């Protein structure tokens, strides 16, 4: 709410991400499923998962250095894992952290490049933690630059880091406030068509038997889905995904945000737009903590802190630290 990149947008963004992670984590599903159990949320009994742990470390690094510092951020990721390994980290990425904890590893980007036979991870862990990049950086150029670099600390495949860029761009656009769904999608599509024309990206996708321009292809499917009658959960999962791959989760989160910009008759009117976006995301099943954390980041940035319900927020572990960090990003980087 209010001006582009306002404090309310910053706070709502990180709160929305925290809500999606914590509320989503129960069901790691059917719209009726979800509605019964948000009943519960009507202190800090909902633990956050690796999505929030890594987002907090990313943001703490940015604040400590008042800039992107790959060595600081890589070590804060590794030390966060060492301090609290049981947050549900991906099976592969834990190898990166263990290599980064070795004090004689001195290029912090190389462990990620060794992952998965030297092709790199395409998991959504780079995207799940990236919203803080869009709070720290106002220009599109800087959002893409450091969304990519922050993601490359663990996700060296263009299929992974282009998902992180796409998530950061969506948060970036949402922080600018009111827009049509079609304009929001169109801007995202243009940026991704630009990135997926790159040779390394084309090959990375070739090598795995994928569409050329996989993110672009899914963003076009979102535009079709937004015009389609009687869209079912099954159709959404089939065309976009609900999985741990960034390309099976990041477009899906953006779809959830765009679809839920308007009221949905099968979700009670008593829920506001942020809540309805989270309820819809979680109803898709699959990687619910991560799809909801990403949809919640976007919706929180767009709708602002006035749509973060206190009862839901106060159920989440660390909600006050999350808020402090949002306020600090606004002070340090948005220079209020
Ligand atoms: N190149 C690849 N080839 C085959 N499988 C892959 C590849 N890349 C990723 N995977 C599969 O993808 C998995 C994850 O890739 P990882 O890099 O370990 O971790 P993340 O940080 O992305 O995990 C993010 C999630 O973890 C948290 O629970 C959050 O809630 C998110 O849901 C691998 O174990 C592989 O099965
Ligand atoms: Mg997850």
Residue numbers in the entry: 14 to 41, 46 to 59, 70 to 363
Question: Can you list sentences taken from the study reporting this PDB entry?
Answer:
ADP-ribosyl-acceptor hydrolase 3 (ARH3) cleaves PAR and mono(ADP-ribosyl)ation at serine following DNA damage. In contrast, ARH3 has a unique ARH fold and a di-Mg2+-containing catalytic center and can efficiently reverse not only PARylation but also mono(ADP-ribosyl)ation (MARylation) at serine; ARH3 can also cleave O-acetyl-ADPR and α-NAD+ in a Mg2+-dependent manner releasing free ADPR. While coordination of two magnesium ions (MgA and MgB) significantly enhances its catalytic efficiency, calcium binding suppresses its function. In the active site of ARH3, acidic residues, including Asp77, Asp78, Asp314, and Asp316, maintain the integrity of the bimetallic center and render the ideal alignment of the substrate for catalysis.
To gain further structural basis for different alterations in enzymatic activity in D77A and D314A mutants and to better understand the roles of each Mg2+ ion in ARH3, we determined the high-resolution crystal structures of ARH3D77A and ARH3D314A bound to ADPR and Mg2+ at a resolution of 1.85 and 1.80 Å, respectively. Thus, Asp77 appears to be important for the maintenance of integrity of MgA and the optimal orientation of the terminal ribose for catalysis. Structural analysis of ARH3D77A reveals that MgA is missing. Because of this rotation, which is an even greater degree of rotation than that found in the Ca2+-bound form of ARH3, the 2″-OH group replaces the metal-bridging μ-aqua ligand and directly interacts with MgB. In this conformation, the 2″-OH group makes additional hydrogen bonds with side chains of Asp78 and Asp316, and the 1″-OH group makes a new hydrogen bond with the main carbonyl chain of Gly115. Consistently, ARH3D77A shows a 23-fold increase in ADPR-binding affinity, compared with ARH3WT. As a result, the 1″-OH group is displaced ∼2.4 Å toward Ala77.
